[PDB]
Design an enzyme around this catalytic site. Structure first.
Site, PDB file in Angstrom:
ATOM      1  N   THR A   3      -3.120   4.759  -4.429  1.00 39.26           N
ATOM      2  CA  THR A   3      -4.082   5.846  -4.284  1.00 39.26           C
ATOM      3  C   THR A   3      -3.702   7.056  -5.127  1.00 39.26           C
ATOM      4  OG1 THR A   3      -2.918   6.667  -2.332  1.00 39.26           O
ATOM      5  CG2 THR A   3      -4.684   5.070  -1.985  1.00 39.26           C
ATOM      6  N   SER A  56       0.798  -1.224   0.000  1.00 37.95           N
ATOM      7  CA  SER A  56       0.000   0.000   0.000  1.00 37.95           C
ATOM      8  C   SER A  56       0.834   1.278   0.000  1.00 37.95           C
ATOM      9  CB  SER A  56      -0.938   0.003   1.207  1.00 37.95           C
ATOM     10  OG  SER A  56      -1.899   1.039   1.107  1.00 37.95           O
ATOM     11  N   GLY A  57       2.068   1.236   0.503  1.00 36.66           N
ATOM     12  CA  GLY A  57       2.959   2.378   0.363  1.00 36.66           C
ATOM     13  C   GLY A  57       3.272   2.755  -1.072  1.00 36.66           C
ATOM     14  N   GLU A 108       1.561 -11.705  -1.071  1.00 36.79           N
ATOM     15  CA  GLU A 108       2.151 -11.339   0.211  1.00 36.79           C
ATOM     16  C   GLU A 108       2.746 -12.561   0.894  1.00 36.79           C
ATOM     17  OE1 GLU A 108       0.253  -9.834   4.354  1.00 36.79           O
ATOM     18  OE2 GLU A 108       0.231  -8.397   2.693  1.00 36.79           O
ATOM     19  N   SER A 110      -0.782  -0.612   6.186  1.00 32.64           N
ATOM     20  CA  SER A 110      -1.291  -1.536   5.183  1.00 32.64           C
ATOM     21  C   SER A 110      -2.809  -1.429   5.106  1.00 32.64           C
ATOM     22  CB  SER A 110      -0.880  -2.967   5.513  1.00 32.64           C
ATOM     23  OG  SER A 110      -1.380  -3.870   4.545  1.00 32.64           O
ATOM     24  N   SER A 111      -3.357  -1.674   3.918  1.00 31.03           N
ATOM     25  CA  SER A 111      -4.801  -1.674   3.714  1.00 31.03           C
ATOM     26  C   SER A 111      -5.298  -3.104   3.552  1.00 31.03           C
ATOM     27  CB  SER A 111      -5.177  -0.845   2.488  1.00 31.03           C
ATOM     28  OG  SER A 111      -4.597  -1.390   1.320  1.00 31.03           O
ATOM     29  N   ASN A 124       5.025  -3.588   7.010  1.00 29.24           N
ATOM     30  CA  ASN A 124       4.539  -2.308   6.512  1.00 29.24           C
ATOM     31  C   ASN A 124       3.586  -1.653   7.494  1.00 29.24           C
ATOM     32  OD1 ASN A 124       4.136  -0.127   4.868  1.00 29.24           O
ATOM     33  ND2 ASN A 124       2.708  -1.158   3.478  1.00 29.24           N
ATOM     34  N   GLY A 136      -1.498  -6.771  -3.107  1.00 31.15           N
ATOM     35  CA  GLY A 136      -0.819  -7.771  -3.903  1.00 31.15           C
ATOM     36  C   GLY A 136      -0.402  -9.005  -3.120  1.00 31.15           C
TER      37      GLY A 136
END
Ligand SMILES: [Mg+2]
Lengths: 748, 183
Positions: A162, A157-158, A431, A206-207, A203, A429
């Site tokens: 978005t 997510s980094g 993981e 994370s989402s 991370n 994605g």
């Protein structure tokens, strides 16, 4: 063979994942004399069997499309991305139909308005890659044909999924002619982050859910409005975290604000006081002020028209879940339990919710059976009581999330009827961690399904291109991960045995694992057991093998919510929202794995309606430095995005295509004047058919030649050899003629 | 497709769908015939009644239990009770659903042979199984070890089980019953 002196190869190096080398003596069939930059000379073993990856010529290096490269392998991809990113600052790149986006941490000008008008109209290949080019390819296909279009974005997510979505929406807004979809959606972002994002070992922020924005267009392709949906939310994190993790940010943002006067009714404590927040042992994220994020979440709610009454409802419910977590049962006897007298957490929970203490205390320790004619109140073991309490917490949180999303949708909708939409999916994605668990197992099953859809779409487009170019389409080879999906999801799969073991009496992770080994151990090539342990199993996924530990699985998979506990909560009169969540059976019995598989089938139904377009995001360095490219991290991200496996699938086929005139131009250096002819197409068919012996390597299309991997490098190498030798001959002749003249001058 | 789960006995019949929390159809297992001369004309006189109907009318009827001591002792009435169970009381066609049937241990083999023959031939059930009552009690009570004592109308039987293996030599059966307690 292709190995000669003055040729370049990639060598494995543990500090940087590949190193360049030059070959000092031509190979002939067990050691190579290899030059380097790290000293002049080295001696390098070949291995029993292997040859290094051979390096592409530098006309193809730095191309805007990775499938322009004549050799396709991890070293070439990693190098080509590194040179585009570091040298030219071109963050965007192509691979087949995928757009790879490499995230600079530095800000760039390139998003600026004018470029939107420059890209618009241009066919996808006619301009260098940029996110606007995919945004157009969607908008153009939407205008040209009935179908909606979808854009699908993957990566840790980094990586900036978005930001990619935000700029795609700016492209749509600016071309379409607007009002205030974009500002509202970006105002929503802090809410969906606060209630849906989490902190994971690899991370922060994370989402844990897949988020889908349907941008709505009028029949005139004016932006009407937008609609939001959410899929694949992991509920299990709410009750349980691994070490060095947090559950969803909002609980910590709420506890960090405990001082504030409106919260005082909640009697919130320090964030590690409660049982659900403390378990990870990691309350404070480094370098975040939680209270500031709380204030930004509240201001985003206010900006989306959630009144402070509802915001205090939301925080009231969250404090309810926290206090519910501390409720602690004493066992009387092995099949019975009770709550101790005047238990403080249950009293605070009942006060916060309004439900009368005696009814909660009664229903938490019993369940009700009923036939149509008779009803029995039955005690339950302390373990079953704990499982039911945690299932009730997960059910409250999941309904609160669905409610907040319904209000965000209420702000985002607009009245005009939606003619068609363009939909931008932010998902996680593939993981893998040192420890892998039911969360990772569900994430990997979702990614296996998405990768199957991607592979089928690419295969369809390539079949259409082959039929267009008059090649036999039966040649193209299709690669299908259905055997893995059937391993995970089909009847007597892993998930189905996990659900069976949940209900079967005296179930355990050991007896589950033993059932796995009995069912699959040698029947399915993709399932494997780690030799040195019996509590783990290995699935060969699309990208990689992954060990999953069994120890979490059954504790996390169980949901069952006892109907009387909901009927108690629904009855509460103190405040509007808690009855409003639960408003509209068998679904209560469903396990978390089954609710996840249903949510993923909904997601796949939504995508299958639509033609996809893909974006991948990769995070070039671990520490947010502006342009540093770390080849280890980028290699890991390229595997996790399935780009390397896509490139493997492509390299089997005909990756490289040339138009007959551009070929003829390039290889006129090779071509002889007798071969030149009044039909260039026939000329090239003849010359190529001589130059490359095995017709299997190539095909003649109507307008394009197709080549297997390496063949364009073969032509480029024979061209460089011929041109070098001819240059040597002319140069030596001119040097001799001039120095011979100087000889005659000295004679004179 | 959800399998049917049906548990016959002397006394009540218990039937419902698998995965339900409790049985959907429960009714005493009786077939009844009138024993008085029907005087009214156009009454709609019926050859025989099953289940709750036979209970309500019972003052008019001879009541016959088609299972004594866990053995089916006239197959026509038992087949009527299954007909009533699938069509009238669950209202679901047997041709869609596997069926699971329940028996007391150490019964005669012919009872299982006839019960399967009637399920395949006369109802066309796509698949069927026959479980032991005591084994199923352990699933219900949440265990894989114990000595079950199970006593209904008709048979009383003990079955010891230890980590999922039965111990056939230790199985005991007795014909004390709700019924002999009634007599
Ligand atoms: Mg019985």
């Amino acid at each position: 063979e292709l190995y000669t002196k003055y040729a370049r190869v990639w060598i494995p190096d543990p500090e940087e994942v590949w190193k360049s080398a030059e070959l000092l003596k031509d190979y002939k069939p067990k050691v190579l004399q290899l030059r380097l930059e790290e000293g002049k000379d080295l001696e390098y073993c070949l291995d029993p069997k292997e040859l290094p990856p051979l390096r592409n010529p530098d006309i193809l290096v730095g191309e805007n499309d990775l499938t322009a490269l004549s050799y396709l392998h991890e070293p070439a991809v990693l190098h080509n991305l590194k040179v585009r990113f570091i040298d030219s600052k071109l963050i965007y790149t192509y691979c087949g139909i995928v757009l790879v986006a490499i995230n600079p941490y530095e800000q760039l000008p390139i998003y600026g308005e004018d470029i939107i008008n420059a890209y618009s109209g241009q066919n996808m290949g006619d301009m260098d890659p940029h996110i606007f080019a995919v945004a157009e390819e969607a908008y153009k296909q939407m205008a040209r044909d009935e179908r909606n279009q979808s854009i699908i974005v993957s990566g840790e997510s980094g990586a900036g999924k978005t930001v990619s979505a935000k700029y795609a929406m700016r492209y749509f807004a600016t071309v379409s002619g607007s009002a205030n979809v974009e500002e509202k959606v970006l105002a929503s972002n802090p809410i969906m982050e606060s209630i849906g994002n989490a902190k994971t070992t690899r991370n922060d922020n994370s989402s844990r859910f897949g988020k889908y924005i349907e941008i709505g267009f009028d029949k005139r392709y004016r932006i009407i409005g937008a609609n939001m949906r959410t899929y694949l939310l992991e509920k299990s994190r709410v009750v349980f975290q691994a070490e060095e993790e947090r559950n969803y940010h909002i609980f910590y943002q709420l506890c960090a604000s405990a001082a504030l006067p409106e919260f005082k009714t909640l009697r919130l404590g320090n964030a590690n006081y409660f049982h659900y927040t403390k378990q990870g042992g990691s309350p404070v994220i480094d370098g975040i002020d939680d209270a500031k994020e709380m204030v930004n979440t509240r201001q985003a709610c206010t900006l989306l028209g959630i009144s402070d009454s509802y915001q205090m409802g939301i925080f009231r419910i969250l404090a309810g879940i926290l206090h519910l977590g501390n409720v602690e049962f004493a066992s009387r006897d092995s099949d019975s339990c009770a709550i101790p007298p005047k238990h403080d957490p249950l009293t605070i929970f009942c006060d916060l919710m309004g439900v009368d203490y005696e009814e909660m205390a009664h229903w938490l320790c019993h369940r009700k059976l009923a036939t149509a004619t008779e009803t029995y109140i039955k005690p339950i073991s302390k373990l079953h009581a704990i499982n039911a309490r945690d299932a009730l917490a997960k059910h409250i949180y999941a309904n609160l999330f669905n409610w907040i999303v319904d209000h965000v949708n209420k702000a985002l909708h607009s009245t005009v009827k939606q003619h068609s939409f363009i939909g931008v999916l932010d998902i996680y994605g593939f993981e893998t961690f040192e420890i892998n668990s039911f969360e990772q197992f569900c994430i990997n099953y979702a990614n296996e399904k998405l990768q199957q859809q991607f592979n089928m779409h690419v295969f369809k487009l390539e079949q259409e291109e082959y039929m267009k170019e008059q090649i036999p389409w039966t040649l193209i080879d299709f690669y299908d991960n259905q055997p893995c999906i059937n391993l995970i999801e089909a009847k007597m799969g892993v998930l189905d045995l996990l659900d069976e073991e949940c209900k079967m009496p005296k179930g355990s992770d050991d007896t589950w694992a033993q059932k796995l080994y009995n069912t699959h151990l040698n029947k399915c090539a993709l399932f494997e057991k780690p030799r040195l342990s019996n509590k783990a199993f290995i699935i060969k996924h699309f990208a990689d093998k992954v060990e999953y530990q069994c120890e979490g699985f059954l504790e996390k998979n169980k949901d069952t919510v006892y109907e009387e506990q909901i009927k108690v909560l629904k009855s509460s009169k103190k405040f509007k929202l808690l009855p409003e969540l639960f408003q509209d059976s068998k679904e209560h019995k469903k396990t978390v794995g089954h609710q996840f598989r249903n949510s993923l089938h909904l997601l796949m139904e939504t995508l299958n309606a639509t033609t996809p377009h893909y974006v991948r995001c990769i995070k070039p360095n671990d520490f947010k430095f502006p342009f540093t490219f770390d080849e280890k991290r980028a290699v890991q991200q390229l595997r996790a995005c399935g780009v390397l496996e896509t490139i493997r699938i492509s390299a089997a086929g005909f990756p490289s295509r040339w138009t007959y005139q551009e070929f003829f131009s390039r290889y006129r250096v090779l071509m002889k004047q007798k071969d030149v002819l009044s039909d260039r197409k026939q000329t090239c068919k003849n010359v190529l058919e001589k130059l490359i012996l095995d017709k299997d390597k190539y095909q003649f299309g109507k307008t394009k030649i197709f080549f297997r991997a390496g063949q364009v490098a073969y032509l480029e190498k024979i061209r460089a050899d011929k041109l070098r030798a001819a240059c040597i001959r002319i140069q030596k002749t001119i040097r001799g003629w001039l120095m011979r003249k100087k000889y005659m001058r000295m004679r004179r | 497709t959800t399998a049917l789960v049906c548990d016959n006995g002397s006394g009540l019949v218990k039937a419902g769908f698998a995965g339900d929390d409790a049985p959907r159809a429960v009714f005493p297992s009786i077939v009844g015939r009138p024993r008085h001369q029907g005087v009214m004309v156009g009454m709609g006189q019926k050859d025989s009644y099953v289940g709750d109907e036979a209970q309500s009318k019972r003052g008019i009827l001879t009541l016959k239990y088609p299972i004594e001591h866990g053995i089916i002792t006239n197959w026509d009435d038992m087949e009527k009770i299954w007909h009533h169970t699938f069509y009238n009381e669950l209202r679901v066609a047997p041709e869609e659903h596997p069926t699971l049937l329940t028996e007391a241990p150490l019964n005669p083999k012919a009872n299982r042979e006839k019960m399967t023959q009637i399920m395949f031939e006369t109802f066309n059930v796509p698949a069927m199984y026959v479980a032991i009552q005591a084994v199923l009690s352990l699933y219900a009570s949440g265990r894989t070890t114990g000595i079950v004592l199970d006593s209904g109308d008709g048979v009383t039987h003990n079955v010891p089980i230890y980590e999922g293996y039965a111990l056939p030599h230790a199985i005991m059966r007795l014909d004390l019953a709700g019924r002999d307690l009634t007599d």
